[PDB]
């Protein structure tokens, strides 16, 4: 009458595995009869491990996943939607901050691909002092942002108004999505068709081009953007919350502000990490996975999970901020009002492919093709004609799907 399941995750660092080992021991203590085994897998090797284990009927019952890869698993039908929805029913949809569960919806809108445990978000980081030393209030829309970037621009001195991604990489697609979605421009419409060559998408693309006249020249990827912000080449930068551990190390957290691209609405990019439960397992394995993920969502356990990356990972469960784990963390206290500001921006999470309560799985192929960041790259670095590049991009996607 004992049952054994596996928890596959990507925390291969010994510190993180120590935290997961104590969570598991706490779980097993409260649920005699259930053993959980760790399966740490480097993020690099995640997909190969998954196809290898699933083609041998040895897929672990519980799997840590980002929301985009959960879409690929759900399309391959590797996810037990009823088990996931059972967990969400237990803790309640109201346990999650608004905007969070929409992102993990299935393509038909009827269920979810996983149970969210954390998120990182992206937006505009800036240096509070430099914007005073220039006479500028923090920007609240496209116009104010462009104006602030122009005022802080100064390329003769190798200083620039904003660090903006422009490379042929997912980072550019993510940061550009924030402006496009702030203009109600999504790559998909509510019927699952590719809607790229649209008026509202052209406006965002035209605005991004104007804004990049104030960024470092050339193809800027993750290292270019981070370096420029960290060494003072630009006092504004679009980046994820993973900049926050670096500000803690190199600089002064008091001096960092955060603003959200806003035009017709506000849009922050976001990546969710979830625990999902896989399909095809014995019923007793499935119920054990259900209890395990439900356990992981209780306040003290979810808080220990999220604090494995303090500053970088945000809580998506409303209970985390009530725990002593959260309020007594040194990193969280060093950041001041920032963690509450960031959590407050979770209702504004928008991503390409998530249209209402449906997240279309063909967005993975769109992203996998690089057409959207390449399009942005061509018009910003290459100086290509914007209207015919947008039109060529629509045609490449139509031909792709
Ligand atoms: K198993
Ligand atoms: K089932």
Helix, coil or strand: residue 291: helix
Task: State residue 36 phi and psi, 5-degree precision.
Answer: -110, 130
- Two tokens, residue 79: 């996810």
Ligand nearest to the CA of 277: 2
Q: How far apart (Å, rounded) are the C-alpha atoms in residues 28 and 30?
A: 5
Query: What is the rounded distance in angstroms from the CA atom of residue 175 to the CA atom of residue 159?
Result: 21
Q: DSSP of 105-128, one letter per residue? A: B-TTSSSBS-EEEEEEEEEEEEEH
What is the distance in A from the centroid of ligand 1 to the CA of 60? 5
351 is written with which tokens? 């991503």
- Angle among Cα 288, 292, 298 to the nearest 5 degrees reads 145
Ligand nearest to the CA of 34: 1
Distance CA 13, CA 361 (A): 31
CA–centroid distance, 361 to ligand 1, in Å, is 27
Q: How far is the CA of 82 from the centre of ligand 2 (A)?
A: 6
Nearest to 318 by CA among 288, 292, 343: 343
Other beta carbons within 10 Å of 287 = 16
Residue 186: CA count within 13 A, CB half-sphere: 22
CA of 291 to the centre of ligand 2 (A): 14
Task: Decide: 353 and 113 in contact? Cβ < 8 Å.
Answer: no
The DSSP H or E segment spanning 91 is: helix 81-91
Report how far residue 188's alpha carbon sits from residue 174's, in angstroms, rounded to the nearest whole number. Answer: 15
Q: What is the CATH number of domain 3-120+271-339?
A: 3.40.190.10
- Each residue of 76-93: b (16+ CB within 10 Å) or e? eebbbbebbebbbeebee
Rounded to whole angstroms, how far apart are CA atoms 57 and 131? 57
Q: Positive or negative CA dihedral for 353, 359, 364, 366?
A: negative
Longest dimension (CA), the chain: 74
The answer to whether 340 and 317 are in contact (CB under 8 A) is: no
Helix (H) or strand (E) holding 8: strand 3-9
59 C-alpha vs ligand 1 centroid, how far in Å?
A: 7
Place of tokens 């001195």: 157
β-pairing, 269-277 vs 115-127, is antiparallel
Paired sense of beta strands 256-259 and 34-40, if any: unpaired
Name the CATH code of domain 121-269+361-400 (choices 3.30.430.20, 3.40.50.20, 3.40.190.10, 3.30.1490.150): 3.40.190.10
- Report, in this order, helix, strand and coil percent for the chain, each rounded to 5: 50, 15, 30
For 160-196, the DSSP string reads -S-B---SSSHHHHHHHHHHHHHTT--SB-TTS-B--
- Residues 30 and 296: beta-carbon distance below 8 Å: no
Eight-state DSSP code of residue 381? T
Domain ranges of the chain: 3-120+271-339, 121-269+361-400
218: left (phi over 0), alpha (psi -120 to 50) or beta: left
CA nearest to 105, candidates 272, 223, 244: 272
Three-state SS for 275?
Answer: strand
- Nearest listed ligand to the Cα of residue 285: 1
Coil, strand, or helix at residue 299?
A: helix
Question: How many beta carbons lie within 10 A of that of residue 185, not counting itself?
Answer: 24
- Give the whole-angstrom CA distance, residue 228 versus residue 220: 10
DSSP 126-141: EEHHHHHTTT-PPP-S
Domains 3-120+271-339 and 121-269+361-400 share a fold: yes
For residue 20, the SS3 value is helix
Q: Which residues contact 324 (CB under 8 A, 6 or more apart)?
A: none
Assigned token pair, 83? 């088990």
What residue ranges in 16-174 does DSSP mark as E strands? Answer: 34-40, 62-66, 115-127
Q: How many residues does the chain have?
A: 401
Q: ∠ CA(73), CA(350), CA(269), 5° rounding?
A: 90
Resolution of the entry in angstroms? 2.0
**∠235-236-237 over CA atoms, to 5°?**
130
First to last CA, the chain: 49
Q: How far is the CA of 112 from the centre of ligand 2 (A)?
A: 14
Give the method used.
Answer: X-ray
**For residues 318 and 180, what is the distance between their CA atoms, to the nearest angstrom?**
29
Written as one string, the DSSP assignment of 190-244 is TTS-B--SSHHHHHHHHHHHHHHTTS-SS---HHHHHHHHHTTS-SEEEEEGGGH
34 class by beta-carbon count within 10 Å (0-12 exposed, 13-18 middle, 19+ buried): buried
Closest ligand to residue 36's CA? 1
Q: For the chain, give me the number of helices (H) and strands (E)?
A: 19, 9
Residues 6 or more apart in contact with residue 177 via CB below 8 angstroms: 267, 269, 350, 351, 352
Q: Give residue for tokens 């506000």.
A: 266
Ligand 2: distance of its center to the CA of 97 in Å? 27
DSSP-based three-state secondary structure for 310: coil
Question: Is the distance from CB of 47 to CB of 73 less than 8 angstroms?
Answer: no
């Amino acid at each position: 009458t004992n049952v054994s399941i596996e928890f596959m995750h990507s925390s291969v660092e010994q510190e993180r595995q120590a935290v997961i080992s104590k969570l598991i021991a706490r779980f097993e203590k409260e649920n005699p009869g259930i053993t959980v085994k760790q399966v740490p897998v480097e993020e690099d090797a995640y997909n190969t491990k998954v196809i290898t284990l699933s083609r041998s009927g040895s897929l672990p019952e519980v799997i840590e996943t980002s929301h985009d890869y959960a879409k690929v698993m759900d399309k391959e039908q590797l996810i037990d939607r009823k088990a996931v929805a059972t967990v969400i029913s237990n803790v309640g949809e109201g346990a999650f901050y608004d905007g969070v569960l929409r992102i993990v919806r299935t393509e038909d809108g009827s269920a979810w691909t996983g149970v969210p445990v954390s998120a990182w978000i992206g937006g505009i980081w800036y240096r509070k002092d430099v914007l005073a030393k220039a006479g500028l209030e923090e920007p609240k829309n496209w116009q104010q942002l462009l104006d602030v970037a122009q005022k802080l621009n100064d390329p003769a001195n190798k200083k620039y108004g904003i660090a903006l991604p422009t490379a042929e990489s997912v980072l550019t697609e993510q940061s550009f999505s924030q402006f496009a979605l702030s203009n109600q421009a999504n790559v998909f419409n509510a019927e699952g068709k590719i809607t790229l060559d649209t008026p509202e998408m052209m406006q965002a693309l035209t605005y991004y081009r104007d804004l990049t006249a104030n960024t470092m020249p050339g193809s800027n990827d993750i290292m270019e953007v981070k370096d420029a912000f960290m060494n003072g080449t630009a006092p504004m930068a679009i980046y994820s919350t993973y900049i926050l551990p670096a500000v803690i190390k190199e600089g002064d957290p008091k001096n960092v502000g955060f603003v959200v691209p806003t035009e017709k609405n506000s849009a922050v990019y976001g990546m969710l990490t979830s625990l999902t439960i896989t399909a095809g397992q014995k019923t007793e394995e499935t119920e054990a996975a259900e209890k395990f993920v439900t356990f992981m969502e209780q306040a003290d356990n979810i808080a220990d999970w999220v604090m494995m990356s303090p500053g970088a990972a945000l809580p998506v469960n409303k209970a985390v901020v009530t725990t002593a784990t959260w309020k007594d963390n040194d990193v969280i206290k060093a950041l001041g009002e920032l963690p509450n500001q960031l959590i407050g921006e979770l209702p504004n999470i928008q991503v390409f492919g998530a249209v209402g309560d449906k997240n279309f799985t063909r967005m993975g192929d769109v992203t996998g093709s690089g057409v959207v960041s390449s399009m942005v790259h061509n018009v910003t670095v290459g100086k290509a004609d914007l209207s015919t590049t947008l039109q060529a991009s629509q045609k490449k996607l139509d031909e792709l799907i």
